[PDB]
Each structure stands twice: as C-alpha cells, then as structure tokens.
C-alpha cells in the first residue's frame, strides 16, 4: 500500500545537447517525471515522493563532509505529491553546467530514505536513477552500497536514453549498471533497466479506479444438515467516480454559502407549508389513491432471514442462458479463509458440477434489509484456483413477451447469393482474432477488457488542464485515447474493398 | 396493437341462474360475480388504463341511454377501481342475491337484440382509441328464444352486425341441469365456433378457471427504448431498434399525502445563499473538486461537456469468435437489436445477411455503443440469435442480435490469493450422487418476487378493507423436508468423508 519513491535526476550539461532530430534526454526525463507525478496526484494512494538532483552547481544535503558528496541537492523531501511539485518541475528545475558521479547521488538518496522513513510504516522503497552515464565512474564504494541496499530492502530502477551507437564511456556505465542489477536481484534485474521512450508509452494513461471488495462470509447450505463456510467477493461491476462534484457559490467559491433544503406545501393559492410529521405515504390502486402509512408498511412488509446462501436445486447448464442474466454484479465464491474442510467440500462440489455439466439454482440475500434474489452459481476451474461464479437470474415479472417477425421466411428481405458472398468477405476481412496454427491458438488483436475507461481519462485530463491553466478552455480528446478505442489499422486496411462491394450490392435509401 | 382493450360483462338475471343444483355448490350468478371481481383485480394490478363495463339483462328495472326495457347497465366503460369492486361485492352472498333482486329484480323477459344494441351504444360512447372490443356472455340458457323466431332472427342480425363492426363475442356457458348445447342457437352469435365446442357440455366452461386465476404481474406493451443507426463504416448505415426483453420490476413509486385529508402535496426543492438569503438558479453556482491540496472550479456546462465523445449509435469495429466471449464477464443485462425499415430502406436485407453469416461462422460483432447524447461510449458484442419455436409453433426466441456489454479494465477487481486443495475422487463421486439426487428442471418463469406479490396483496386488502391480507406462498425458499427425505444417508457419509470428527461447521 504505502510507498516512498526518491526520484534521482541528472542535470549535468551532458544532457543539455543532443541530436536536433530527436528530443533531448533532459526533456524526456522531465516528461517522464511529470507524468509519474500526475498519476500519483490523481491516484490518492498515500504514497510519498522526494526529488534529488545531481549535476548542479548548488550543494545542499545532510552529509557534506569534504569534497565528497558535492553538486547534489535534495530539492524535495518526503511528502505527499501536490500541484506545487508539478509547478516546481516545470520551472524551478533548470539545466546545470557541473558534472557529478551518480554513486554519490545514490548515497544521498539512501541517506534521505533512511532519515525520512523512520516514524512511518513504509512497506516499500524505490530509487529511480535518470542518468545518461556520460560522467566518469568512481566505483570505490560498491560493496558497502550493495550491503546497505540489501540491509534496508530498497528497490532500484534505471532509466537511460537508449534501449538495451554509444561511446565507450556509456558502454562501461552500462556494464557497471548491469553488475549492480545482477548483485541486487540477478538475472531478472536486467528487466529493471528501461528507456525514456518505453516509459513514456506506459505512463501516458492515468491510473485506473481501484476499490477493495469487502469479504462477505456466509454458509452454502444443501438441505438442513450440509453446510460449507464460504466467502464471497464482487468480481465484475460498473465502476463509478469515487468523488462527486460539489456545488459552490460563484463569487466566494465556497460550499458553506450554498444551502439546499426541501419543503412540502399543498395545492392551494396560499401554498401553506406542512411539516414532515404531517406527511403520510400512499399508493395508486387504479383510479384512486390508497393511504399506506410507513409504520403499517413495515408491519406488513415481507420479512425474511437475512444473509442466506441456500441451494434451491441443480439444473443442466443448457437450461440457463446468458441472455436472462440480471442484476448489476458478479459474485465470486471461495472457501472460508484458513479453512481446509470447507475448501475440500467446495472443491468436491465444483468438480462434481463440472463433471455432470450442471449449475446450482440458489437463493441469495445480502442481509436482513436486502430483498431476496434467485440466481445461478456455476463452477469456474483454472490451473491454479477454483471457485463458484454467481449471477442473478430473472423473476417471472421481469420477463417480457414481445413478438417479432421472422426474417428467414420473408419473401421481401431474402438475401441473394452475391450479397451473402459479400457479407462473408467482409466478415473474413474484418477478423479481430488471429489463429496461430503452430499452437492452434486464438490471439485477440483487440482486447477490450484491457482498455481503461475513457471517461476517467477525460475527467483527469480536464481537471489537470484547469489546475495548471486556470483561465483557458478545455482541450480536445487526446489522440491516444481515440487510438486505443479503435481497432488496429491493419484490420481497417483490409476492410476497404469488401465495404465498397457491400455498398454496391446493398441499396440503402434514407427515408 | 395500439389503443386500449374494452370489455363488457353481460350477466343473465334469469331465474334459472339463481338455482343451485346442490346445497354445497355455488350458484351461476355468484360464479359470474366472482369471475368479474377477479378480472377487475387482475386489470387493476396489470393494466390500470383499460376500460371495463358490467351490464345485466332480464331484470325488471332498466338504466340505459336508449331507455330499453329489462336492461340495467350497472357500470359503464370506465377504468377499474376499488369502488366498482366494492359495489359488486354486495351481490356475492345469498344476502347479496336478495339485495340484487330487490334493487333490480329477476324473472322478466328480454331480447338479445336490445342487449347487443346497448353494448354497441356503450362501445360507441368511449372517446379513446380502442384496439380491442370484447363482450362476454355469462348464461346457462342455450335456447333464450325458443317460442319466437323473429326475435332469434333479430338477435342473429345484430350479432352479425356487431361482428362486422369488429366486436368479439365470447360465451362463458355455465352449468345447466340438463346440459348446455351450443349447436342450438349460440353457434351463430358466437364469433368463433370451435370444432370441439359442439358437444353437449355438462359442466361450466374451462375459461372460467382461467378467469379466476389472478395475475398480479404488470403487463407492458411492446416498445423500443431507442432507434439507433448501425454504421459499418462512415458511409454504410442501417437503422436498428433496441428492446429490453428482460427488465427489473419495481414497486410503484410512493406518493406523498397530507395526514388531515389525504390530499396530495407538491414537493419543491430550492437553493439559497446563507449570507444573502437570495434564491439561486442552477446556473449561478459552479462546481468544485479538491485534488492535490487545491480547488478546481468547472462550470456546469463544461462538466456536462466532459462526457461528449461521439454521436449516438452503434459503430462497427470487427468480428470476434464466440469462444473469446466469457460468461463470468457479465456487467449489465443484455438488450435485443432488431431491424427498423421505417428510417432506412434496405436495412432488413443486410441485417438478415449479417445474422445468417454470423450464425454460420459462429462470430459476434464487436461494436462501440452510445445510447444517448453526452454519454461515454461502451464496448458491446452483438451475438446472433436464431428464431426458436416451441411445439405449438409459438415463438419463444425471436430472431435478431443480443447486445451484451463488455467490462473495461476498471470493472474488474483483484482477488485474494488462495491455495488450491483438490478433493479425492471418492468425495467427488459422493457429491455427484447428492447432485443427481437433487436434480430438477429449470424455467425462466418458475419463480415470483415475494416482495412485489406481498405488496400487491397488502394494497388490495387495504383498498377493499378485507379482514386480513392474503399470504403469498414463497417458492424461492428451499424445501428442507423434501431434500432431507430424498438425500437419505448421503449427507452423513459425505460429512464423515470430508470433515474431521470435531469440526463444528456452524461454530
């Protein structure tokens, strides 16, 4: 949960000049840091960020000593991210002329983490080095540095202007970086060295809205003698904005100057008001209104024993169709935590249901106040975990009986052979799945489940633009948002000729 | 089918209708009154906007616009209500029969031509559009006019004229001491003479059982939620309609009433300044959100404009194998997409071709869906749906597309890591035996909502001032006794084979 990130940056003149045809490393590092800060600011995860820079004329750090530990400034200490940090990044951080050795910067960052970590339960620590490795290396303290890293349990990451045409100094720097990564973690450490181009792609989207499901304990009952302790969570649901807009007064910009209140009055010329204690409930029964006081309604309300998970019966999976699924959530049911007998019983039930190809029609009630529901629980078995998936089912009232004409036996809308061939060509050309024959596997070229919701992206973009530009119209939708919402260009390219043929074959006249 | 359904309850008031064959039996008149009351309650619960009427013939008094003799129109065409049910309730019992005899009378003559004329006049008075016109005849006299043939001819002519006008006629024949015979006179008056409805019936009609079966579920006529455009690309567009074959049923919204006189009140909301006291419309106030220890102010118009992505409709993206679709990825109830030829001509042909080819190749059309203006787009899959009929050729599954919503990355939640424990084959076999013992067939209309049923029962009891509310049997409660009897000893063996001696699942 909680985390501390110490962004170490290089501001030496080595990054102030580069090929004019490509962006300079300094600008790329600034962009990456800005994107990370935006993501952290708009994702309230109680994570703290500090900023240290090496390669500047200034010198401000806890450990000064002699000539060692110089040209390093702890610009920003450990604190929650905020917009002033972004403003400081935009303007305050400026290029420097002096060079510095990033080992001293790493020492300074480690000292900062050690000093500022005490007093808080920081379960994770990270240090990211944004360096071009142009400066010379003084590897006279590698052993103690690695020992301190291991003792303090601090993670390390690197960001370089090139992915794994460089000077021999850069090659030596890469070699020492690889040695450090191998010592810290080993082979997998080679995957912790990134490039600015790679990081920009990954950090171009705001973080997703994340919530923690509440564990729901209950007992799956089959009869009055068999019971299995189970825990249910919510797997799939429509995510909403955590925070809502607050109404404020235009002039003073305060929520304390605006008051909302509801009043009741009769349909008379005077519009006299009536208190809430003289207001009763009523319902419509045909052409007249029947009073029904709330106390009487509670007296006559349907009462049930809350928190029930009972197995009404078992039915073949064919009888239950997906088109009848109701509700607004999907429940995942596992065995009770720290419970072996319950796990064995649930595994037996899941395996029996899968082998027999059947599902369980069950009655589900969240609590005493919740209305009872009838739903379907079906097994879900994977190579590593098994569980039950529960989805609500419709009542007799919810079903609607609508009659529609038959298209197969229509003498006016019957497609011709050429039309069917054109539709077949269109379907074949616009395929979104690739069939690899070697593995005989289907690969999804357009995975929808991995696309962040554009609504939150747009909201965060507009809020950030307003915060950094108080007086400016909102911008348009970002290009990458449109790109991620459209199929790959390859699919679009192959669909031109089939679409033209379908236009030619199918008349369409707007009425 | 556009308009309202109108029904008239013609009830014979002859002497033969007030005689009970056996002491412990219901007279035909009481049965007719009960059927009328049941239909009234069903209409109130299901379709409160329909019109009903109640007319009696063969009585001594009369009440009609044309001033005929021996025809008392007890209730004209009007929406059903509790008052009419209460009025009819005063004829249910024997004392009710005496009250009916005193109020109107019985044992007088009558002419069917006058009855049909009065029914036609009642139908003509209604000003609303009437999709259906229907009359029901509750009688047990197969030969209403045996002595006179001119009256029979006039009745036949009037019935034919009514049939031409478009008025359906039904005969709810009741028990007769001798036996009802439709072939005598009612073969012609009745709109449809079924082949099986030609023998002599010795018992009341089977339609009375259907009438007495109360239906307490609302009925909604077919309607399209939206009529959108499917865009294969920028220049190929067809018109489709969206429907909700499944929709959650909710209790009717409560109404706020005044305690003193039960007079409805009006509720108004307003916003005022604390330091000034003035009233602010919903345009003076701004909107705020505190991010990064700072306040961001956006106007209402900008807040609404944040949600503008693309114009309403469905935009085609590609075709995906149905295997990739997942059952556990349910996010929202599915919808039904059907052709709509009114907006665009030629949509039906392309839709049919697409459906046929999608069924042949087992693919689903991935699309971007925007129901209304200023609504963020969603990703949906149109799965082909073939036409499936039952034994009696009644359509059970219409042809079209099933629109299923697909979750985004934010709609999924991470799960706690749990170690997997596999059950031995013997335990799985015992559980298979239990499951087979507890097998049953499932249907979509095999359950009812207890809350809604109880609410309707309570509302009816309150409106009609019944002694106690009718209790609704809950079919969703597990049958513990039957399950225990069927399972037998299997539960004990499973518990012994899966649980340690001292486990105590309840604790």
């Amino acid at each position: 949960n909680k985390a501390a990130v110490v962004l170490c940056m290089d501001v030496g003149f080595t990054m102030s000049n580069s090929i004019p045809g490509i962006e300079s490393p300094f600008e790329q590092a600034k962009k990456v840091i800005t994107m990370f800060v935006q993501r952290q600011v708009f994702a309230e995860n109680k994570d703290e960020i500090a900023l240290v820079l090496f390669g500047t004329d200034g010198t401000d750090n806890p450990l000064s000593g002699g000539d060692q530990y110089q040209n390093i400034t702890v610009h920003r200490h450990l604190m929650l991210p905020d917009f002033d940090l972004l403003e400081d990044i935009e303007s305050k951080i400026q290029p420097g002329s002096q060079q510095a050795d990033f080992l001293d910067a790493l020492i300074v960052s480690m000292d900062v983490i050690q000093h500022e970590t005490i007093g808080k339960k920081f379960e994770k620590r990270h240090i990211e080095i944004f360096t071009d490795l142009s400066s010379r290396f003084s590897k006279s303290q590698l052993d103690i540095i690695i020992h301190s890293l291991k003792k303090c349990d601090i993670s390390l990451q690197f960001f370089l202007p090139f992915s794994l045409g460089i000077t021999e100094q850069q090659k030596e720097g890469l070699e020492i970086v690889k040695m450090v990564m191998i010592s810290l973690e080993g082979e997998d450490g080679l995957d912790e060295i990134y490039s600015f181009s790679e990081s920009l792609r990954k950090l171009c989207v705001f973080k997703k809205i994340e919530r923690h499901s509440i564990h729901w304990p209950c007992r799956l009952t089959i009869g009055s003698n068999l019971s299995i302790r189970i825990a249910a969570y919510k797997s799939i649901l429509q995510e909403r904005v955590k925070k809502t807009w607050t109404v404020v007064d235009a002039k003073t910009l305060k929520k304390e100057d605006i008051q909302k209140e509801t009043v009741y009055c009769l349909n008379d010329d005077d519009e006299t008001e009536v208190l809430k204690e003289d207001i009763i409930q009523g319902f419509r029964y045909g052409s007249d209104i029947v009073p029904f006081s709330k106390v009487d309604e509670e007296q006559m309300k349907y009462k049930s024993e809350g928190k029930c998970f009972s197995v009404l019966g078992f039915c073949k999976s064919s009888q239950v169709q997906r088109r009848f699924f109701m509700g607004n959530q999907v429940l995942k049911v596992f065995a009770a935590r720290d419970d072996e007998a319950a796990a064995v019983a649930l595994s037996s039930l899941i395996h029996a249901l899968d082998d027999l190809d059947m599902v369980a029609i069950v009655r589900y009630a969240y609590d005493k106040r919740a209305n009872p529901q009838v739903g379907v629980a079906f097994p879900h078995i994977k190579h590593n975990y098994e569980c039950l998936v529960y989805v609500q089912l419709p009542f007799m009232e919810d079903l609607r009986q609508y009659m529609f004409s038959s298209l197969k036996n229509s003498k006016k809308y019957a497609p011709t052979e050429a039309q069917l061939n054109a539709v077949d060509a269109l379907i074949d050309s616009m395929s979104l799945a690739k069939k690899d024959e070697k593995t005989d596997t289907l690969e999804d070229l357009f995975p929808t489940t991995k696309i962040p919701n554009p609504r939150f992206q747009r909201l965060f973009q507009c809020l950030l633009h307003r915060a950094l530009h108080p007086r400016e119209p909102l911008p348009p939708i970002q290009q990458h948002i449109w790109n991620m919402l459209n199929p790959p260009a390859e699919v679009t390219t192959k669909s031109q000729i089939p679409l033209s043929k379908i236009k030619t074959l199918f008349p369409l006249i707007e009425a | 089918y556009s308009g309202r359904d109108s029904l008239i309850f013609l009830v014979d008031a002859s002497k033969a209708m007030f005689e009970s064959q056996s002491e412990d039996e219901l007279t035909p008149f009481d049965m007719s009154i009960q059927c009328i009351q049941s239909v009234y309650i069903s209409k109130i619960i299901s379709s409160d906007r329909d019109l009903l009427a109640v007319v009696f013939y063969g009585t001594e008094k009369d009440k009609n616009s044309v001033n005929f003799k021996n025809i008392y129109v007890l209730q004209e065409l009007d929406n059903p209500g509790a008052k009419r049910i209460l009025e009819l309730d005063q004829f249910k019992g024997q004392q009710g029969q005496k009250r009916f005899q005193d109020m109107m009378g019985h044992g007088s003559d009558y002419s069917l031509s006058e009855v049909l004329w009065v029914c036609a006049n009642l139908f003509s008075d209604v000003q609303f559009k009437m999709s259906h016109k229907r009359i029901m005849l509750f009688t047990n006299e197969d030969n209403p006019h045996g002595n006179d043939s001119a009256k029979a001819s006039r009745a036949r002519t009037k019935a034919g004229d009514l049939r031409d006008t478009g008025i359906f006629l039904d005969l709810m024949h009741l028990k007769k001491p001798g036996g009802f015979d439709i072939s005598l006179f009612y073969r012609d008056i009745i709109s449809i003479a079924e082949d099986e409805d030609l023998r002599v019936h010795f018992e009341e009609s089977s339609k009375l059982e259907d009438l007495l079966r109360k239906v307490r579920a609302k009925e909604t006529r077919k309607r399209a939620l939206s009529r959108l455009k499917l865009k294969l690309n920028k220049d190929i567009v067809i018109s489709v309609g969206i429907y909700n074959l499944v929709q959650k049923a909710l209790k009717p919204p409560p109404i706020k009433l005044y305690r003193e006189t039960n007079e409805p009140v009006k509720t108004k909301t307003r916003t005022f300044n604390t330091s000034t006291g003035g009233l602010l419309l919903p345009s003076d106030t701004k909107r705020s959100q505190i991010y990064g220890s700072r306040q961001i102010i956006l106007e209402k118009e900008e807040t609404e404009e944040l949600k503008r992505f693309d114009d309403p409709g469905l935009m085609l993206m590609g075709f995906k194998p149905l295997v990739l679709l997942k059952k556990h990825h349910y996010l929202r109830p599915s919808l039904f997409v059907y052709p709509e030829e009114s907006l665009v001509i030629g949509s039906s042909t392309l839709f049919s071709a697409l459906l046929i080819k999608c069924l042949e190749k087992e693919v689903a059309a991935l699309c971007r869906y925007t129901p209304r203006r200023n609504i963020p787009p969603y990703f949906v899959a149109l799965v082909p749906q073939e036409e499936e009929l039952d034994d009696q050729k009644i359509q059970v599954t219409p042809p079209g597309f099933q629109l299923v919503f697909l979750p985004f990355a934010d709609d999924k939640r991470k799960m706690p890591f749990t170690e997997k424990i596999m059950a031995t084959p013997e335990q799985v076999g015992k559980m298979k035996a239990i499951v087979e013992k507890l097998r049953f067939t499932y249907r979509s209309d095999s359950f009812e909502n207890p809350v809604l049923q109880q609410h309707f029962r309570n509302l009816e009891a309150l409106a009609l001032d019944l002694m106690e509310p009718e209790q609704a049997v809950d079919l969703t409660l597990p049958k513990v006794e039957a399950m225990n009897k069927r399972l037998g000893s299997l539960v004990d063996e499973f518990k012994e084979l899966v649980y340690p001696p001292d486990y105590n699942p309840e604790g």
Partner: peptide, 23 residues
C-alpha cells in the same frame, strides 16, 4: 391462436409458477 390470455388480449398466457419440482 391457442394460449392467448383472455384477461389481456395480445399477451401470451403465462403458466403458474411451480417453483422446484424434483424429478
């Protein structure tokens, strides 16, 4: 058109709910 609902024309009659009936 067998099975049509007498009470509500134009709507198919619905059989009474039977709950669970074990085979």
């Amino acid at each position: 058109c067998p099975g049509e609902s007498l009470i509500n024309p134009g709507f198919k009659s619905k059989k009474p709910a039977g709950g669970v009936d074990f085979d």
